[PDB]
Amino acid sequence: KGCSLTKAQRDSIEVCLLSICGQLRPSMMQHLLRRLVFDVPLLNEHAKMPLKLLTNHYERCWKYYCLPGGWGNFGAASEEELHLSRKLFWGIFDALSQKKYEQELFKLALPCLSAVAGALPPDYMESNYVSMMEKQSSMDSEGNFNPQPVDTSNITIPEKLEYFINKYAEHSHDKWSMDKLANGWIYGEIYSDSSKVQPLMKPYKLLSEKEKEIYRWPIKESLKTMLAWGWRIERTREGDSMALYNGYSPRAIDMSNVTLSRDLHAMAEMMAENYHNIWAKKKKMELESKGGGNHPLLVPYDTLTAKEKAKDREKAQDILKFLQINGYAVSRGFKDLELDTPSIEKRFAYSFLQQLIRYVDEAHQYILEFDGGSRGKGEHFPYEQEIKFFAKVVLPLIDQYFKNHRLYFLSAASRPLCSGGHASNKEKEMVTSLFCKLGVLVRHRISLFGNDATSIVNCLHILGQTLDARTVMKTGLESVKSALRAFLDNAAEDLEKTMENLKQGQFTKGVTQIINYTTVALLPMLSSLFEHIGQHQFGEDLILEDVQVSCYRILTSLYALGTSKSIYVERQRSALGECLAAFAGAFPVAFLETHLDKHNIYSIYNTKSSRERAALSLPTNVEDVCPNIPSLEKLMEEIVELAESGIRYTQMPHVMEVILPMLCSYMSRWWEHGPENNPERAEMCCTALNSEHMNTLLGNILKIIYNNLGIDEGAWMKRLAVFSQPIINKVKPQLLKTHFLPLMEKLKKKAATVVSEE
C-alpha cells in the first residue's frame, strides 16, 4: 500500500505477496482478508493487487469454502469469513456498477467477482446474528490504525465481586512477593533498590488501602472493561466453599496445569486486543505530546508478533484461570437476538439473484428506452457503463455462478445434491423469471449488441441447463408462470414469422438480420431448453396443457425448417439439425406414429374436453394439425429405400441428413417408451417401436454410409455416431454379438478412411 516504491519495487512486492499467499495455508489468511475488506472497494491504483489476490486465493479455495466439510485436513469455513466475503462481493459489485467503466480494471475484477460468488455457498443462511462490534483499529481511513477501546466508565462493578477483588489482589500481592524475592529485595524500613531492602513483607490483610488501591486500579479498570463488553458472570458453590473455609510467605501455588477452552481463547484474544488498544491509545497521547517519532509496536495487535503478544496473553490467562479457581462462569457478551434462518430470503443465492433480477430488469428497461430513442440521431449511451458493466460482468457473473452451481440450482433437497444445500422453490421460480428476462432482452437486439450476443446465447444456454420443471409447476407464482408461458409462446411466434417470411422469401436488409438473430440465438437456445428438459426427464411433465399446442406450433415450424432448402440453410444446417434432434426428445407425442397417436390419454387431444375444442381453433385431428409430417411407417419405407439407394452426400444430402438425426432422437427415447419397454399397457402405450426395428434401422444407416464412403463422407454422421453410442449401449448386448460385431469388422474395412471410425 505504500506509494514511495518504484514500479519494479511494486512488481516485486506484488509477486512476493501473491506467491506467499498462494502457497499459504487457507485458514491463516483471515486477518489479511479482513484488512483487505475495506481497501478493495476503493478500486484505486493500488487495488489491482488485492483483486488478483482475491481471485487466485478464492479459486484455490473453490472446494474449501463451498463444501460444508471443506478439505478434511484444512477443515472448513468459520462463517465469519463468509459474512466478510459476502460484504466483499456486494461492495465490489455495487461500486463497480456505480463507477466509471475502465476496461482493464473491470476485466481484472470480473474473475474476482466470479471467484467470490462461487466460493460463497448459495445455500448460505444470512444469520440475523452476524459479526458485530467491528474492531475499528483496522478501520482507520489512513494507516489502518485507530486504536480506540470500548469506553467503560459508565458501567459500575457490582457488590458480589468484592470478594473476587480481594482474592485476586491477594494473588497479585503473592506474585509480587515472589517478584521481590526473585530480584532480591527483602524486608526493611523503606523501599530501596540500592541494598535490596524493601518493606512490603507485611500481609495483604494489614496492607494500607492506598497501596492496596494501587493494585485495585489496574484490576478495577480490567473488571470494568470486562463488564462493559457484556460478559455474563455466574457464581458457583466453590465460592462459598471459601466462605465456609474462613507476616506470611505466599506458599507455592501451581498455575500452569489448568487449561482454557477454545471459545474462551477467542474471547481472551479480543480482550488482549482491547488491552493493546488501551496501551496504543496511551502511546498515541504520549507520541502526540512528544510531537514526532514512531514505535515498533505502533502496528495493530493483529500486525504484532508473538513476543509482544506474550505479555497480554499471559496477563489475560492468569486472571482467567484464577476466575475458574474462584468459580465464576464467564460467557459471551450478549445472547442471540433472533434467527433469520426460517426465511429463504436470507439465503445468499436468494438475495444475490434478487439484486441480480433488479439489475437485469433495469437493463431491460434501459434497452427498451434505447429501442425508443435509437431512431433519434443521438446514439450516445447515458447509461453506457451501466450496460457494458451488465453485459461483460453481470452476464459472465450469471454464467460462472450457474456453472459453479450446476447441481445446487437443480438441488431441491429431493436427492439432487442430497448432502443438502438446495435452491429454494422460489429461487428456481426466480431463476425461470431470469431466463424469461434474458429472452425478452435478447429478442432482436443482436445488432445492438457489440458482438456480445454470443456471450448472451451462452448465457441463455446455461440458464436452460439450470431449470426444475416439477418445482416450478407445483410451486410457482402466477406472474412467473405467465412469464414462462409468454416466453414459449413468443418463441413459437418468432419462429412462425420466420417460417412465413422464408416461404414468401423462398428466393435467397432487415430480414437478413432477423434470420441471423434466429439461427444464432433463438434456435440454439430453444434447442438447449429441449436438450435439458428431455435429458432431465421433465419433458413430459413440463408439457401438459396449451404448452402442448405451443410445442405443436414449434414442431410445425421446425419441420418446415427441415424441409426448407437454401445456401444459408446449408451453412447454418448443423444448428438446424441439432435443433431438430433436441426437439424430438423434448416433444412428448409420437407425431410420426400417425396410426397410434390418438389413443394416448396423456395428451391435450384427450384432455381437450369438447366445449374447449370449440373454444380453441383446431383441425380436430392430430394429423390434420400437422398435415405435412409423414406417417412413421412411411418415413421408415423412405429410410429403407434410401438404404437400397445409397445416395451421395453431395448429390442428395437434404432429406437424408435431415431425417436421420430426427429418427435417432425419436427412437432413442421412444424405444424405452416402446411397447416391450413399457410392460404396462403394452402395444397400447405411447409407441410401438422395438429392438428388431431399430436394429434394422442401424443396419440401414450403416448400409448407406457404405455408399457414402465414395464421396469421402461428412462430419454430421460422426455426430450421428455420437448420438448413437447411447443407442448402442441401450440396445441389448445380444444384438451386439453376431450383428454389430460384424459391423465392427465391416467398419474395420471402413478404417481405410482417415476419419476416426467410432
Partner: protein
C-alpha cells in the same frame, strides 16, 4: 414364567450366547458390532406440553373443540350401532357418551377436552400452526344424512360437514400418526402410574396388558381405532377452518451410531504366519449386507483399533463410499449391494493390486485397473476385513477352488492363486479383541509416558506417570486406567522406631499415591483392583463398579454369612480431601493399607483414616491401581514407601524380600494401562451342540456329546490364562 417376556413378533429360540458357532470356514458369517438393543425397555416418553399456554385463538375456540369432541363421541358410538345409558357396559350396550356433556361424566368430558387441547398443543410443539382461515369457515356448516340409526339423543348434532372435500396434507397425516403415537404413550404412562406391566396374555389380577407396547409394536386393530378417531378429529378441526400450515419435513440423520460399547468396527485377518512375499494371490469377500465394510490386504503390524486404510499398514477397499484406503481415501470403483462378492488380487512381483465386483475389474478414476500403483514388499501381506455396525461378511480363502464363485471368470486366466490353494488345514483367523486387557505402557506411546525414580536415602522409590499430549492438540481427555503389574495375595485362611518384631510378624502392606498439584483430584481414583477388572468406560464412578452380595444362610433362612464381591476397591481423591478448592497447593498423598491376614482395606489421606473401608474374601489377588483423567501434564505418582508398623509393598509382592523392611522397586514391577489394541484368536474347532424343540410337552433340548480340550498357558503374576 419366562416365556411371557417374548416380544409379540419374535419367536422364542435357544441360541448360542456367543456369536460364532462350529461350521464351515467359508460359510462362517463374520459379524461386526451389533446395534444396541434399547427397544426392550419400552419407556413411554411424552412430549412435554404443560409449559405451553393456549394462544388466544385456541382459547376462544376451546368451547367449539369441546363441542367437536362431544360430536365425536355421539357419532362414534352411534356409527357403531351402539346406544345410550349410564353404565359403560358393552354387553347391555349402554353409553353416556351419546348424550349431552352435562349428563356425560364431567371428569372424562374435561379429560378429553384437554387431551384435545394438548392435541393441538402437541401440534404447536411439533410446529403445526393452527390458525383460523376466515370467518366463513366457521359460519358455514354442512348438513349430513341423519337417519334414525345415525340419530343421537343430545343436541350437538354429529353433522358438521362431510370430510371428503377436506384433505389433510401428507406431512400433516404423518404428524397425525406421530400424535397418535404420543397419545398411546400417554395411555401407557398412565398405566405405568397405576403400575401396569406388560404381559403377552391379558390379566387383571396380575394386572398385566399386552397393549403396553410401543406404537410400532402395537397391533393393527388398535392402530386403526386410534387412527380413525384422531384423524377424524383433526379433519373436523380443519373443517372448523383453523388451517394449520404444516411444519417442514425436517430430514433426520440417524447417523447409524448405536453400537454397543465404543467399538465401531470389527477387524478380521488371517494369522501372521501366512504372510505372502511373492506370487499371485486371490481371495473372495462375500457381502451378506451392504454397509461400512472394508476388505483388502494388511501388513502383520496392522493395529486392531485403527480403521483399515487410514494409515500405511493396510490397503483396503471401501465400497460403501466407493473409495480405496491407504494412508487416505480416493474415489475408486463403484458401490456394492447385498450379496455382491468382492475378489481381491495381489501381485507381489509386479507390485500391483486390484479388486473385482461380481467378476468385473473395478476401475480407478483414471482408466487404469490397478487399485494401488506401487508399494514395498516389506514383511508381507495378509488378507484382512473390517465390518461396521450390524454388518455380516464372509471371507473365502479358496481352500476349495469350486467354492470360489468368480475365480473362473476372473483370476484363473491371469494366474492368480487362491490364498489357501495348497493347504491341508484351514487358515487360522485372528480378530480384534472386544475385551480390553492390561499391558505394560509402551515407550513410544503418543499420550502416556512413565518415568522410574530410584529411591534415594530420604525418598522412597517412585513411579511417575506423565502425559506428553498435554500442551498440544489430540490430548485425550479420557479416563486412563493404570495398575501395577504384580498382585498381593491375601491369606488362604483368615484368622478369627517401629518394633522389629511386630514389623517382622505383620502382614500389612502399604503404598502411597501423590496427586501432583494442578491435577484435579476428583478426576483421580486410588485403590486396588482384581484380575477380573475389564471395564473400559469413558465415564467412571464408584457407584457403577460391579458388585454382588453372596448371602449363605442356615436351614431356617437366617443369614449367617454375607459376602460382597467386587473387582474394584478404590476411592476418590476429591472426596478424600477435606479443604476443597483451597487446597491443590501441594501434596494430596493418598495412602492405601492392606491387611493380607484379615482382608481389611483401609485408606489414609494426609495422615487421617478415611471412613471408607473394604473387606475382601480370602485368597483375593489385589492389584494396586489408579484411574485418572489427566488435567495436568503431571498426573499422580506411585510411591512405594512405608509408614510406621506397616510392611512395604515390595515385601508383599516378592517372596525373596518377604522379611526385608527396606522399600524396593525391582524391575519386574512396572505400570500397566488398559487398552483395546490386542488381537484374539478364533478357535479352529468349536463344540458340536444341537438345539431343537422336542415338543410343547418337553421343551427345548440342547446336547453336546463330543469332548474338546485345549492347553491353557497360565501367566502366574497376572492371574490370567491364554490358549
Amino acid at each position: 414364567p419366562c416365556y411371557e417376556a417374548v416380544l409379540p413378533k419374535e419367536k422364542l429360540k435357544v441360541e448360542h450366547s456367543r456369536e460364532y458357532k462350529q461350521e464351515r470356514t467359508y460359510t462362517r458369517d463374520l459379524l461386526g458390532p451389533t446395534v444396541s438393543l434399547t427397544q426392550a425397555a419400552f419407556t413411554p416418553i411424552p412430549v412435554d406440553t404443560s409449559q405451553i399456554v393456549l394462544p388466544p385463538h385456541l382459547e376462544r375456540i376451546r368451547e367449539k373443540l369441546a363441542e367437536n369432541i362431544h360430536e365425536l363421541w355421539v357419532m362414534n358410538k352411534i356409527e357403531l350401532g351402539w346406544q345410550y345409558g349410564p353404565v359403560r357396559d358393552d354387553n347391555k350396550r349402554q353409553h353416556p357418551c351419546l348424550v349431552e356433556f352435562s349428563k356425560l361424566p364431567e371428569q372424562e368430558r374435561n379429560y378429553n377436552l384437554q387431551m384435545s387441547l394438548e392435541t393441538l398443543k402437541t401440534l404447536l410443539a411439533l410446529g403445526c400452526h393452527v390458525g383460523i382461515s376466515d370467518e366463513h369457515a366457521e359460519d358455514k356448516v354442512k348438513k349430513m344424512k341423519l337417519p334414525k340409526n345415525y340419530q343421537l339423543t343430545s343436541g350437538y348434532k354429529p353433522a358438521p360437514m362431510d370430510l371428503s372435500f377436506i384433505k389433510l396434507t401428507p406431512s400433516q397425516e404423518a404428524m397425525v400418526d406421530k400424535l397418535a403415537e404420543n397419545a398411546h404413550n400417554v395411555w401407557a404412562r398412565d398405566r405405568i402410574r397405576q403400575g401396569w406391566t406388560y404381559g403377552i396374555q391379558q390379566d387383571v389380577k396380575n394386572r398385566r396388558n399386552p397393549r403396553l407396547v410401543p406404537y410400532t409394536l402395537l397391533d393393527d386393530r388398535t392402530k386403526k381405532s386410534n387412527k380413525d378417531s384422531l384423524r377424524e378429529a383433526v379433519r373436523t378441526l380443519l373443517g372448523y377452518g383453523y388451517n394449520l400450515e404444516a411444519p417442514d419435513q425436517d430430514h433426520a440423520a440417524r447417523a447409524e451410531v448405536c453400537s454397543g460399547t465404543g467399538e465401531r468396527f470389527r477387524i478380521f485377518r488371517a494369522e501372521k504366519t501366512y504372510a505372502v512375499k511373492a506370487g499371485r494371490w486371490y481371495f473372495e469377500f462375500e457381502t451378506v449386507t451392504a454397509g461400512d465394510m472394508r476388505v483388502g490386504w494388511s501388513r502383520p503390524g496392522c493395529q486392531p483399533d485403527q480403521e483399515l486404510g487410514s494409515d500405511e499398514r493396510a490397503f483396503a477397499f471401501d465400497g460403501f463410499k466407493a473409495q480405496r484406503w491407504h494412508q487416505g481415501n480416493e474415489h475408486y470403483g463403484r458401490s456394492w449391494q447385498a450379496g455382491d462378492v468382492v475378489g481381491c488380487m495381489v501381485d507381489m512381483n509386479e507390485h500391483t493390486m486390484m479388486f473385482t465386483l461380481n467378476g468385473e475389474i473395478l476401475l480407478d478414476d483414471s482408466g487404469s485397473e490397478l487399485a494401488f500403483k506401487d508399494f514395498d514388499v516389506g514383511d508381507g501381506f495378509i488378507p484382512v476385513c473390517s465390518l461396521g455396525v450390524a454388518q455380516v461378511g464372509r471371507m473365502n480363502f479358496g481352500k476349495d477352488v469350486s467354492t470360489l464363485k468368480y475365480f473362473t471368470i476372473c483370476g484363473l486366466q491371469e494366474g492368480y492363486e487362491p490364498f489357501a490353494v495348497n493347504t491341508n488345514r484351514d487358515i487360522t483367523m485372528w480378530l480384534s479383541k472386544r475385551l480390553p486387557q492390561f499391558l505394560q505402557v509402551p515407550s513410544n506411546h503418543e499420550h502416556i509416558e512413565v518415568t522410574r525414580i530410584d529411591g534415594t536415602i530420604d525418598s522412597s522409590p517412585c513411579l511417575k506417570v506423565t502425559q506428553k499430549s498435554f500442551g498440544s492438540q489430540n490430548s485425550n481427555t479420557d479416563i486412563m486406567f493404570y495398575r501395577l503389574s504384580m498382585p498381593i495375595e491375601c491369606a488362604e485362611v483368615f484368622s478369627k522406631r517401629d518394633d522389629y518384631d511386630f514389623l517382622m510378624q505383620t502382614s500389612t502392606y502399604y503404598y502411597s499415591v501423590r496427586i501432583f498439584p494442578g491435577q484435579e483430584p476428583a478426576n483421580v481414583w486410588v485403590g486396588w483392583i482384581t484380575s477380573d477388572f475389564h471395564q473400559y468406560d469413558t465415564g467412571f464412578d464408584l457407584d457403577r463398579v460391579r458388585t454382588v452380595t453372596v448371602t449363605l444362610g442356615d436351614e431356617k433362612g437366617k443369614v449367617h454369612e454375607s459376602i460382597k464381591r467386587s473387582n474394584c476397591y478404590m476411592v476418590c481423591a476429591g472426596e478424600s480431601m477435606s479443604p476443597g478448592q483451597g487446597r491443590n497447593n501441594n501434596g494430596l498423598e493418598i495412602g492405601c493399607v492392606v491387611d493380607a491376614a484379615s482382608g481389611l482395606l483401609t485408606f489414609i489421606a494426609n495422615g487421617k483414616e478415611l471412613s471408607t473401608y473394604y473387606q475382601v474374601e480370602p485368597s483375593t489377588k489385589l492389584f494396586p491401581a489408579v484411574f485418572a483423567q489427566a488435567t495436568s501434564p503431571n498426573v499422580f505418582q506411585f510411591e512405594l514407601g512405608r509408614i510406621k508398623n506397616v510392611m512395604p509393598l515390595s515385601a508383599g509382592l516378592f517372596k525373596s524380600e518377604h522379611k526385608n523392611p527396606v522399600p524396593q522397586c525391582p524391575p519386574r514391577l512396572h505400570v500397566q494401562f488398559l487398552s483395546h489394541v490386542l488381537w484374539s484368536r478364533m478357535p479352529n474347532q468349536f463344540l458340536k451342540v444341537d438345539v431343537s424343540r422336542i415338543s410343547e410337552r418337553q421343551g427345548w433340548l440342547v446336547q453336546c456329546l463330543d469332548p474338546l480340550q485345549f492347553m491353557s498357558l497360565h501367566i502366574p503374576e497376572e492371574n490370567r490364562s491364554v490358549d
